[PDB]
Amino acid sequence: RFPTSGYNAYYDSVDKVVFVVVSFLYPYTTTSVNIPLSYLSKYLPGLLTAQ
């Protein structure tokens, strides 16, 4: 499961959806890197409107 503390749960209130983004697959899981906003505005039409 994802953390109960030490996380970020983002609340897009324009699609009204609670999302968490985590770096997973190969190669690098170890080497955490912030996930962009760019491809996420694709897949949520409410990060295509507002924060």
Binding site: V14, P45, G46, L48, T49
Partner: protein, 51 residues
């Protein structure tokens, strides 16, 4: 005139077209519209094609 929050002002300032709030998915309308460029040279370009 009387403004929002119960103030009164003399001034009018309008809403600008292409930064309104849509009811389409609760979005925001584009900065360039067909209606925009149609009016941005309305002198010919409001007379369109048949319409």
């Amino acid at each position: 005139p009387y403004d929002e929050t119960g103030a009164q002002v003399t001034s009018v300032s309008s809403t600008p077209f292409g930064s309104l709030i849509d009811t389409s998915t609760g979005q925001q309308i584009l900065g360039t519209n067909p209606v925009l460029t149609s009016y941005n040279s309305y002198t010919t370009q409001a007379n369109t094609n048949m319409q």
